[PDB]
Amino acid sequence: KVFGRCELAAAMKRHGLDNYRGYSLGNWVCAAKFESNFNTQATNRNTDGSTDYGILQINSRWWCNDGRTPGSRNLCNIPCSALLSSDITASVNCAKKIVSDGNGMNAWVAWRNRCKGTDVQAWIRGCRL
Breaks (C-N over 2.5 A) in the chain follow: none
- Contact (Cβ atoms closer than 8 angstroms) between residue 63 and residue 99: no
Phi, psi angles (nearest 5°) of residue 87: -95, 130
Query: Rounded to 10 degrees, what is the CA torsion of 30, 32, 36, 39?
Result: -120
How many CB atoms sit inside 10 A of residue 51's CB?
18
Experimental method: X-ray
Domains of the chain: 1-129 (1.10.530.10)
101 marked as part of a ligand binding site:
yes
Catalytic residue among 18, 52, 66, 119: 52
Q: Is 52 known to be catalytic?
A: yes
Q: Is 87 known to be catalytic?
A: no
Report CA-CA distances (Å) from 84 to 101, 115, 120: 23, 23, 25
Catalytic residue among 7, 18, 35, 48: 35
Closest CA to 95 of 36, 47, 44: 36
> At how many Å resolution was this determined?
2.0
113, amino acid identity: N
